[PDB]
Design a protein around this ligand. Structure first.
Ligand SMILES: CC(=O)SCCNC(=O)CCNC(=O)[C@H](O)C(C)(C)COP(=O)(O)OP(=O)(O)OC[C@H]1O[C@@H](n2cnc3c(N)ncnc32)[C@H](O)[C@@H]1OP(=O)(O)O
Ligand SMILES: CC(=O)SCCNC(=O)CCNC(=O)[C@H](O)C(C)(C)COP(=O)(O)OP(=O)(O)OC[C@H]1O[C@@H](n2cnc3c(N)ncnc32)[C@H](O)[C@@H]1OP(=O)(O)O
Ligand SMILES: CC(=O)SCCNC(=O)CCNC(=O)[C@H](O)C(C)(C)COP(=O)(O)OP(=O)(O)OC[C@H]1O[C@@H](n2cnc3c(N)ncnc32)[C@H](O)[C@@H]1OP(=O)(O)O
Ligand SMILES: O=P(O)(O)O[C@H]1O[C@H](CO)[C@@H](O)[C@H](O)[C@H]1O
Ligand SMILES: O=P(O)(O)O[C@H]1O[C@H](CO)[C@@H](O)[C@H](O)[C@H]1O
Ligand SMILES: O=P(O)(O)O[C@H]1O[C@H](CO)[C@@H](O)[C@H](O)[C@H]1O
Ligand SMILES: [Mg+2]
Lengths: 475, 475, 475
């Protein structure tokens, strides 16, 4: 129907002890504010307002970025002074027309696990019972901090008492206020006009509209959500880590039911935007971050961190730290491999142990197996780079590119002093410093000939164990 | 006594969403079918039949392999059409003589944590009470999917109702059918001849023989196992990961009571065939896979993956990815070390940081400390390989071997272009390309002499910060 | 007040199956005995005695070391024969004056999570109720092994029955004896003089003084601690790992409330002496060990192990194994970096992928990015070490030092054969073996010139795919 959702992100969040605003702390690839705005946008409300207190100039541009990603307008109201949650709703009420007749949903920006289904059931129950206010509730083993729900024996809601304003008998109430409301626009404005600051924290409690609307004879309703994590709030980093662990278990479980093997979900972190193909095995200690895409029948080996990495089908990424890179079908990466942004490994390519690639395009079937740095280079198809090689892309002042052809066989400890081009099918010997272009089919060497200095050990290392091993060898 | 166990592995397992059959999905080093057949074989039943539906030609050879490992015959019956668990038992009943007089135990191939003790207590209780059928039961917080146990107030078993055929009041029953049965051969055949397909799934429910045998006046018994994990079944990958985590905790706990320190059992995976010595410390992020053998007083450092690796006593394997290798007593491996198949590190040997070994035998006390690839090589005792060295074992067409003597001291950045032999006590200078044999006690060099081009920086890098550091140095 | 605490560390701890004494097994950076003695010393008792049985000569020096660290005297009594906990207290009673009039607290050396607050509430309750003996109790789901608390319906304590001396009805008691006592010095000595060895284990049960003092009309009190982990004991390595995991969760949670982001507390181990600055992010798979100090706004990346490493502010330590090193402000370390003792990385320095440093001082802004070993070296400010370089610090017999100036630009695959000095602003070409000093502003090369052997591939690799790629290139 015609609804308007308001997100209250004006709280200071002092218990986070962070120079970064609370609602912008991230989990599973999105900030808490981004998590809330994503779920609200999936219901497509007619209006959406975000109330910001201080840190408003630091958070407001990120609200506009989310408005661009979700493809709609997201208004922003600003609370001048921290006068409580009631005053914050009144600030967000100025961003609507004074003649607004739709429902008004109130939420906070620190409930990251809140989904569109819980909000849909909130407005659905709100309409089905024809209530003036519907509040979301849940039951916790520790109801500390939250506002307590006061109900009579017939389970009808009487009021909500805050933690700072609760008697010891009321502290024992384990049904808590989730902070997600659904109002009638007219009945709400009437309540907040009658709010009193005569409380412990000396603020305008939005929670007091429950009792105010009860004294008016209006229908007061509370919808109890059993899944407490969906409505849990974040005030400290301990709760942020708890909700991040819970959200990660649900993300991993969804991939498993889709056909993805996650050996150790406890030590496997997967962001919300990550896609994994069918019959892919993910080993412990792995984090899938950002917009990482894993194809089908892959093996993302243990202790692998991937951020915005696109991997094709049937590839193996074992013990790899990569970001902003592409890995083709059937490619083998790892173990102990470092992928910097700009890495495009072709299909059936190999980047082996102790190899670092940065801003390089390596064609189909080319292998870089051992102890090599590949920076700002272009390598063809079905080539082979010897071990202990380096693509020298820094002359001390600027960066230069290197071009390597197809079907080449470069020797071990080959230094490519860019800019240098290596033709197709070319060879370089072991220990070659390539400073000039190598034509196709040529062999490039530079190392001097081998010189053997006989019995040098017995003359310069006389009392050494090696001198005795050589003296005993002459027998 | 005289028993016959039948494993029903004919289910499709559609909720796994895998091109691999369900019962062949692995955990703790064995497939689910291998886990079940291992426990059954420890009781030594007279007959053992495995019922297979589709995927039968893909699973049947693996049943014969398990028959070879467990040293006995394992028969295989095949269900032509998926007509339910009752028809599957009838298919497996054709693999016995028609005059079989022993007990008949029925199990499934997706209960990997089932052990021989639970099966022994099943047949023992079955004999002690003289029942015609004994079924294993357990109590779960979520009894969904499982068949519900219907008992009267005197706890006598009446029937088993499937999830698809259960009233809402019967769904609330939390005592579930574990799927492990123990029958009388004659009383069983009589039941399955009277099965009806008039149910929701239109199949022959083996569970219906509980009520059929009750209507015959036969003794019906249910044995309740408190340890629900021992009889839990796998249908999706989420349950496969849950049981794998539970089985791993029990494997780790057994090692700890035997004298093995596991710092973080949550992030330590140990397969069932792994043996670890007394007073060995295992650090977080470690996986012990396959037939890996760890000696006593070892330190398997953090983030170490070992598959079929044999490590002696008093060795340290820190941050190492190894497979099909041997590590001698007192050897030091890691951190960041890659061990390929064929690696035989002698006692008190060292393979240090960023070292990869493949199909190489390195003698006692030899050290390969830094940034070295050792492939297809043989190194003697008490040698020392300089850093940044490479054993060149690939000339572009074939692979060649390298031989290194004892007590040698090879310099840094030494390229061993195989085939090359290095005598005992030999030396090679830094930056040497060894293309010919080095006699014992000789020194092999190849690098050109050092040439200093004075004030080259001020001429070719004029406006650089290095030119100002050199201009200021002349003071 | 005037108190005397006695720690009973005389037990054999046979279920640990360790050649190391039980109380010296470590967790969170301290042994169990060190954990107990640290909490006791925070209350500053007048006397402190540690009772040791066998392993006494192996544990006693570590008690004196703790006496030095905590800045007070810690006496040591020795139990000649394992005659039970009652005889052990009598042995520790000989280390006091026979005229001691203060309270006497008895504890064990295998309760590592015991803090000074629990001990303070023990003596406070002991004084407030004027009891002759106060014992700490808790409730467990599995009370096995522990001594059971026998209370009447008015909750008054009657006696403590050991596990070996308990009837089946007494085994069901879930309130257990924590083993932490508080005695009156006179009432205690009177009890232990009346102890009888007529029990199952044939020992002097210190627990029997509860019933003895009850038969004397003395006030017997039991203080129930709800937090069972604070008083839990260790007898096997399974319980040692459980308490280590619990203690780590509390250490991590304290850092989070202080302003430290711990993404995965389950896979993040932090020792008790570690300090972490505000707004530092710690990624999964990380262990902070020893006296490691992390500054503010840092990023300790995933899979990082740090022991006694001091990191400044705004630095990044990703995928790094380091120990006994210092990392300056704004420095970037990792991924895949090995820091050996003696490493002093200046501010804004860089130690990149596959780099190992050992006993080296690298100045401000100097970068060592790829595949380099730096051992026993001194590098100036704003220098740059090329990839695949090695600081040769071992001539086969002894170790030599290397000196590198400021603003230098050393080329890739440069071998520094120590002892060698490199002046400020100097350059070295790729593939240079530096055996002599390089003056400031000079360029040091040694590699021979490049030689191209045309169509060598078609002559020496005739039937190879590279020969066809070169034959097709001539078009
Ligand atoms: C572990 C891995 O990843 S391996 C992957 C990379 N593979 C390699 O490193 C392969 C390295 N192999 C080599 O360098 C070998 O020396 C090869 C393949 C060049 C051998 O080539 P050959 O067939 O022996 O060449 P041949 O002897 O016919 O002549 C080549 C010429 O170049 C010179 N030369 C050959 N190899 C080298 C070298 N490594 N360094 C310097 N000069 C060399 C020779 O002196 C000879 O010159 P001359 O005979 O005119 O004086
Ligand atoms: C970090 C680590 O892992 S270290 C482990 C491995 N250790 C090493 O790398 C040690 C490397 N050390 C070297 O190469 C040294 O140069 C040493 C040990 C050879 C020095 O040897 P010296 O006693 O100086 O030899 P000396 O000067 O008597 O004569 C040796 C001859 O070989 C030549 N030579 C010596 N070293 C080298 C070298 N590194 N490259 C090329 N040629 C060399 C010299 O020119 C000299 O020839 P000439 O005098 O006839 O012209
Ligand atoms: C991936 C990374 O980490 S990069 C980090 C480290 N960066 C590097 O490795 C840079 C390496 N760059 C080089 O070695 C280049 O060859 C440079 C910078 C020396 C080029 O210098 P140039 O301006 O070409 O020198 P120029 O040609 O004027 O003369 C230099 C002399 O030294 C010789 N020389 C130059 N480079 C080298 C080398 N790499 N090996 C051996 N000799 C060399 C030349 O033969 C020339 O001698 P000549 O002309 O008298 O016969
Ligand atoms: O497989 P190995 O022996 O480790 O590796 C060797 O052969 C490979 C091809 O087979 C080459 O790409 C490697 O350069 C070489 O070191
Ligand atoms: O111990 P360091 O200095 O890291 O290592 C150095 O000495 C070792 C012997 O002591 C040698 O094996 C290494 O090649 C050398 O780099
Ligand atoms: O940043 P890159 O290209 O990986 O690294 C390159 O430039 C750096 C400076 O920008 C240098 O320190 C490195 O030696 C060089 O390899
Ligand atoms: Mg090298």
């Amino acid at each position: 129907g015609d609804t308007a959702v308001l997100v209250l992100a004006a709280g200071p969040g002092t218990r986070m002890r962070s120079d970064t605003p609370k609602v912008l702390h991230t989990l599973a690839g999105r900030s808490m504010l981004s998590h809330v705005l994503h779920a609200i946008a999936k219901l497509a409300p007619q209006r959406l307002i975000v109330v910001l207190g201080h840190d408003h100039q630091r958070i407001a541009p990120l609200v506009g970025e989310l408005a661009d990603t979700l493809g709609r307008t997201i208004d922003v109201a600003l609370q001048d002074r921290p006068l409580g949650t009631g005053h914050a709703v009144l600030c967000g009420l100025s961003a609507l027309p004074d003649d607004y007749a739709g429902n008004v949903v109130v939420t906070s920006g620190d409930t990251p696990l809140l989904d569109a289904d819980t909000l849909a059931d909130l407005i659905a129950t709100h309409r089905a019972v024809s209530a003036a206010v519907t509040v979301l509730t849940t039951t916790l083993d520790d109801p500390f901090g939250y506002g307590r729900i006061l109900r009579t024996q017939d389970h009808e809601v009487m009021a909500i008492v805050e933690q700072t304003d609760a008697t010891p008998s009321q502290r024992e109430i384990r049904e808590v206020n989730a902070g997600v409301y659904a109002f009638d626009i007219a009945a709400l404005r009437s309540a907040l006009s009658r709010l009193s600051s005569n409380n412990a924290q000396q603020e305008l409690y939005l929670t007091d509209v429950i009792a105010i609307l009860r004294s008016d004879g209006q229908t007061v309703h509370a919808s109890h959500v059993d899944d407490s994590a969906l409505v849990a709030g974040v005030n400290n980093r301990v709760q942020l880590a708890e909700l991040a662990s819970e959200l990660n278990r649900r993300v991993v479980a969804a991939h498993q039911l889709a056909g993805v093997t996650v050996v150790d979900p406890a030590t496997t972190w997967i962001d919300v935007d990550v896609t994994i193909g069918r019959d892919t095995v993910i080993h412990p200690g792995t984090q899938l971050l950002g917009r990482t895409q894993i194809g089908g029948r892959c093996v993302v080996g243990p202790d692998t961190t991937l951020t915005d990495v696109a991997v094709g089908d049937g590839a193996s990424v074992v013990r790899t730290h990569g970001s902003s890179s592409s890995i083709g079908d059937g490619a083998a990466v790892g173990p102990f491999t470092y992928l910097r942004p700009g890495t495009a490994l072709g299909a059936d390519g190999k980047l082996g142990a102790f190899v670092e690639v940065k801003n390089s395009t390596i064609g189909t079937g080319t292998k870089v197996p051992h102890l090599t740095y590949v920076g700002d280079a272009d390598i063809g198809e079905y080539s082979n780079i010897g071990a202990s090689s380096v693509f020298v892309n820094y002359d001390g002042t600027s960066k230069r590119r290197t071009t390597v052809g197809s079907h080449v066989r470069t020797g071990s400890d080959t230094m490519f002093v860019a800019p240098v081009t290596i033709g197709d099918g070319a060879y370089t010997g072991a220990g070659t410093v390539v400073r000039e272009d190598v034509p196709p089919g040529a062999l490039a060497v530079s190392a001097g000939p081998q010189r053997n200095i006989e019995n040098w050990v017995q003359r310069k290392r006389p009392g050494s164990p090696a001198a005795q091993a050589s003296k005993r060898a002459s027998e």
